[PDB]
Amino acid sequence: NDKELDQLLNEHFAGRVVRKDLTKLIKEGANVPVYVLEYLLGMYCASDDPEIIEQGLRNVKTVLAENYVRPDEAEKVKSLVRERGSYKVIDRV
Amino acid sequence: ESANDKELDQLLNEHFAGRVVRKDLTKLIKEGANVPVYVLEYLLGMYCASDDPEIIEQGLRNVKTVLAENYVRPDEAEKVKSLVRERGSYKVIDRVTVKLNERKDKYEASFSNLGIKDAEISAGIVKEYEKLLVGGIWVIATLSYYFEEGQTSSPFGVSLLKPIQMPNMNMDELFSGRAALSTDQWRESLIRSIGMEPASLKEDVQWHLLARMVPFVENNYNVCELGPRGTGKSHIYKECSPNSILVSGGQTTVANLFYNMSSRRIGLVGLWDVVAFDQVAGISFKDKDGVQIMKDYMASGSFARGREQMEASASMVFVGNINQSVESLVKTSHLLAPFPEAMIDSAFFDRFHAYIPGWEIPKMRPEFFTNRYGLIVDYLAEFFREMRKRSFADSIEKYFKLGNNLNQRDVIAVRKTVSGLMKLLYPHGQFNKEDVRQCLEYALQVRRRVKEQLKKIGGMEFYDVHFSYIDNDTLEEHFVSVKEQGGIPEGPAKPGFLYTIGLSNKGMPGLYRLELQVTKGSGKLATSGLWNSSSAKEQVKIAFDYFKANASRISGGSKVMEHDFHLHVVELQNTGPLSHLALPSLVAFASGLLGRSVQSQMVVLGDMSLGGSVTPVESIAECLQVAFDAGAKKVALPMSSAADIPTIPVELFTKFQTSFYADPVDAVFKGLG
C-alpha cells in the first residue's frame, strides 16, 4: 500500500514528493537550506530507478558546487559578470 | 635523522620549489619589522636563490633595504600622498583591496594603511590577480597622480603592481608532492611549516599540533583549548595565518561579530576562516542574547538576526590559560571552570566539536624552533583555505562504524574531526585502513573529553561516555579512553565504590572500578560501561539474581524489591572488557543497599556462578602484582584459591592483609567488615 500511496501522491501532488531519505545523503555538507535540496531532488528525480536517482543526485551535487556565491567572493563575482557579460549563480533573490 | 632531515630538504626543494625556505633566517628579520610574517616569507622566497651563505646574507640585506625604503608608516601616510604628487609616481608597500564602482564602471583600489579608498586601477591589473577582489593582498605598488580641473574621479592611479603573497594555487602540484612523500614525512613537514622542530617533539604532541590546525580546514568546526601559559596557543592564529583573526579579550558585540543591521553587513564570521577568542576567561557579551546567538550558530552553522537567516562558515576556537594543576582542575567544576560563568551552560558546551588538551604540550623553548626547510606560511594558509572546500567525513563508513554511545551531536563532531585530520594528512585521497584507524581514535578521544566534562556538569543526561568504534571486517569493538584523565585512592569511599582485578578479553590482568548508585525504586537493575557485552551483562544479571535470592542472609531486613540499583564499569588500565564480574557486582549491591563503605584498599578477586559456586582466581600472582602496583593493601580471595598460594611469591604475598572467604555471602561479610 506504501507504493500505492506514492502512486496517489504522484498523481495528485505531482512534483511535491521527494523521497525524504535521499536528502540526508546530501547533509554530508553544503551551504543551502534543506527544502531547497528537496525541491532540487524532486525536479531531478526523474524516476525510481536507483541508478537514475544516484546519477541525478550526483548532478545536483555538481550543480551546487559549481555556482555557489560564497559571500566573501561576492565582489569577485561582479567582475566575472562585468568581464564575461553574463554569469550564472545560485542565490536568494 | 640528519640524513633523513637532509633528504627531506631536497624533497621539499624538488616538489615544492619556490615554496620552501630555511625558516630560521626569518626570525633574523622579524624583530625589526611591522609587516606580517607571510609577506617576509614570500619576499625571501623571491630574493633567495640557493644555500650559499653569502647569497643568503645578501638577500637578507636586499629584503631589509626594500622594506625600509618602501614601507608606509600610518602616521607618515599623508606624507606619501604629497610625494606622489610632486614626483609624479612613487613606489609603496601596502595591503590593497579592490571594488568595482558600478556607478563609474571602474575598478577602485583601497590602500588600507595609506588611507586611499578609491584609487583608479586598470582592468588588466585586476584580471591578472583575482586575489585582489577577495580580501586584498600585500603588494608593491607604483602610485601615480594625474589631476585635471573639474575631474570627478580619484586623481591617484596605480600603474605597476606586484603581489607579495602567493598569487595562485596549484594543488595538483601539491598532491604530487604529498604522494611523493611518506605520511611521516608529510606530518613532520607540516609541523616544520609552523616553525617548530619536529625531532624535538613527541608523536602525541605532533597530533595535538595537527588538531590545532584542524579548525582551518573544517567549516563551523568549534574547538576549545585550555593550557599553561607559554605553549604558543595564540601564535598560529595571530601571526602564521592570513585567514585567521585573534579577537582579543573575547569582548565583542553581536553587531560586530555576526551582523550589523545598520550597515546590513555580515560580521567577522563571514569574513575570516578562523575566529579565535584569546584568554576566554574574559568573555562576556553586553547583550544577553549574544550567548543565544553563539549557541545557535555553533549548533546549526547559521543564525537568524531579525527576520533573516544567514549562514557562515567561520570556525571558532577558544584558547585559554590554566592557572591550576592539571589534576586539581579535574576536581574543580570540571575542566572549563576557567570559562566565564555566563558561558557555563550544558547546551553551550555540547556544541564544542573538540577539546584540545593544551596541558600535555611542553612549554615553548628555543630548541623547539626548527632551523630547517618548511613550507611558506602563505602557501600553507592557501592550502588550508582550498582544502576547506572538500569532504572526507565519509571515510569511516569505508572501514568502521560508530558505537551506540554516540548521539547525533557526538556523531557529527567525530565525523568533522576525522574529516579535518584526514584532509590535513591525506589531501591526495589515497589512504589505508590503519591511517583512518589512528585519526578516528584521536577524534573519538578528543570528543570523549568534552563528553566527560559535559557529563560532570549535567549529571545523568550525558551518561554515554564510553565511545567506541566497530571494525567492519573483524567486528571487534575497540573502546577509546581519555588516557590522560583516565590514569585505588586512599581511605574508604562512599558505598558503591570498589576496585576489582581480572583477566580481560585479551587474557591480561587489569584493574576496574565498579560504581553503584541506589535510589528508591522497585528492584530494577540498570547497567552502564559494560562494553555492551552480552556476557558481562549476563554475569551482572547473575549477581543481581543471587543477591535477590539471598537478601535475607545479608541485609537482615533491607528490601531489594523497594530499591533500584544502577551499576557502572570504569576501566582504569585500558586492558579490555572483563566478563568475571559476578562477585564484585554482588559486593557492590551489598555495599550500596546496606549503606556500608567497603574496607579501604581492598581488592575482591574470584567469581561465582548463579548458584553461588565460587571459582578459583585465574592468574592469581599477576593479579596480586597488579594490586600491589595500584596501591592495594588488602585482598579478598576464595578459599579454593588458597591452593594457589604456594605459587605466590613471598615478597609479593607479605604486602597484603589476605582474606579468604568460603561462599559469596562470606565474601560480602569479609568485604564489608
Radius of gyration of chain A, whole Å: 17 Å
Q: What is the count of DSSP helices of chain A, taking H or I runs of 4+ residues? A: 5
| Largest Cβ-defined interface | A-B, 13 and 22 residues
- The dominant shape of chain A is elongated
State the share of residues found in helices of chain A, binned by percent: 55-70%
Strand content of chain A: under 5%
- List the helices and strands of chain A in order: HHHHH
- Structural class of chain A comes to mainly alpha
Count every beta strand of chain A, where a strand is a DSSP E run of 2 or more residues.
Answer: 0
- Termini separation of chain A comes to 41 Å
The oligomeric status of these chains comes to: part of a larger assembly
Major β-sheet profile of chain A: none
